[PDB]
Design a protein around this ligand. Structure first.
Ligand SMILES: Nc1nc2c(ncn2[C@@H]2O[C@H](COP(=O)(O)OP(=O)(O)O)[C@@H](O)[C@H]2O)c(=O)[nH]1
Ligand SMILES: [Mg+2]
Lengths: 386, 12
């Protein structure tokens, strides 16, 4: 069965993200068939909790001939912030809906910048409410405004598919508008490279437990985050301290020996020659040369409200919070933007972080900020720095 | 190793 792609609709409020979303599910339904669905029943997005953090999120699926799509759509700007930083709704591409009327509005920019921070790799634009727009080559000088903005945060604005349409008329059933819908589904099909499967990525395993087998080496355990480890392959141990190289002489699971550990599985991996006291929980095992240890990086951080597990009072830099990456805690110091001292609950900000030791990480790694025995923040690494 | 239904564990 088909390859799976994660999209959702992003962009400023009441520009049409929710109607577009229903229009799609309703066009492709009357076209190829399947399930159509109601604006009413999409707009009133249910609450679901990603680790204490509550987000209002509707999840719609539709099918093109070549692809299955999981579409995410949210009611408030805040939902989009929490969802994007959190990973609760990772996207292989976003549909940026801009109203023909207003032009890029304040969330338009923020949803693009946040898309870059959080590692959304492709954006496709839909100029909406065109049925409202009456004459001229504004549609054209607006398709330019959207392009400079898009290139302003590093997306190929010049190469960007921009579809003009009316989500309402398309949902009402105007055939010439049901058209730009199907045209848009073509662009998801054509412009978003089908995403790499986890089992296809280089091997990575966050280390949970470590014990010796005397006379053989040491065993480290965890859930394979991605890739395949096969018996006989070299691996590295990365983070927290000096990288080391080893060979995998075996893989076990539930007391059974295997030829390999695969993404998704909890496994033991025996490392020949390595001794116990030189591996720490918090290190990772990884295909050699595919992930590096950094101590410094740039992230986007959302400060939890009290309701979702943090504090009703603002977070102040300068107190050395704990950053939690995969399996461990490690102290860091923060630099905030210029002039800013604190971050209000429910707000998000950019943070440059310097840890006290190295952690294996690339852009897009998630993490939690703790301080005083309380999870106060959720972050994503936007760019590794050293 | 050490596990056997679903926790972290192993052997080699
Ligand atoms: N006339 C017209 N109305 C639209 C169009 N797209 C959305 N709607 C209207 O514009 C408003 C915003 O709709 P919605 O999808 O809920 O906005 P969003 O999810 O907050 O961006 C509603 O009154 C819709 O009926 C369009 O292309 N043309
Ligand atoms: Mg909405």
């Amino acid at each position: 069965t088909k390859p799976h792609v994660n999209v959702g609709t992003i962009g400023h409020v009441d520009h049409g993200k929710t109607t577009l979303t229903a229009a799609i599910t309703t066009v492709l339904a009357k076209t190829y068939g399947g399930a159509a669905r109601a604006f009413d029943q999409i707009d009133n997005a249910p609450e679901e909790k990603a680790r204490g953090i509550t987000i209002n999120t509707s999840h719609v699926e539709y099918d093109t001939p070549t692809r299955h799509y999981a579409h995410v759509d949210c009611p408030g700007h805040a939902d989009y912030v929490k969802n994007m930083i959190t990973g609760a709704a990772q996207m292989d591409g976003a549909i940026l809906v801009v109203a023909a009327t207003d032009g890029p509005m304040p969330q338009t920019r923020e949803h693009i910048l946040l898309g870059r921070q959080v590692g959304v790799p492709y954006i496709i634009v839909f100029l909406n409410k065109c049925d409202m727009v009456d004459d001229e080559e504004l549609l054209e000088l607006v398709e330019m405004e959207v392009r400079e903005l898009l290139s302003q945060y590093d997306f190929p604005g010049d190469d960007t598919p921009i579809v003009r349409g009316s989500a309402l008329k398309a949902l009402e059933g105007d055939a010439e508008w049901e058209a730009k819908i199907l045209e848009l589904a073509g662009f998801l099909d054509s412009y978003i490279p089908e995403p790499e499967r986890a089992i296809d990525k280089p091997f990575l395993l966050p280390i949970e437990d470590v014990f010796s087998i005397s006379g053989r080496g040491t065993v480290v355990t965890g859930r394979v985050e991605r890739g395949i480890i096969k018996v006989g392959e070299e691996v590295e141990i990365v983070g927290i301290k000096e990288t080391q190289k080893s060979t995998c002489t075996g893989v076990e699971m539930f007391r059974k020996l295997l030829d390999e550990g695969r993404a998704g599985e909890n496994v033991g991996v025996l490392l020949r020659g390595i001794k116990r006291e030189e591996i720490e929980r918090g290190q990772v095992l990884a295909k050699p040369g595919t992930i590096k240890p950094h101590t410094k990086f740039e992230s986007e951080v959302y400060i939890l409200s009290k309701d979702e597990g943090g504090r009703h009072t603002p977070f102040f830099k300068g107190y050395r919070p704990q950053f939690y990456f995969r399996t461990t805690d490690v102290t860091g110091t923060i630099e905030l933007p210029e002039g800013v001292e604190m971050v209000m609950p429910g707000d998000n900000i950019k943070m440059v972080v310097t840890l006290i030791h190295p952690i294996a990480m690339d852009d897009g790694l998630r993490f939690a900020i703790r301080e005083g025995g309380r999870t106060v923040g959720a972050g994503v690494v936007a760019k590794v720095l050293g | 190793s050490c596990n056997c239904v679903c926790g972290f564990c192993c052997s080699x």
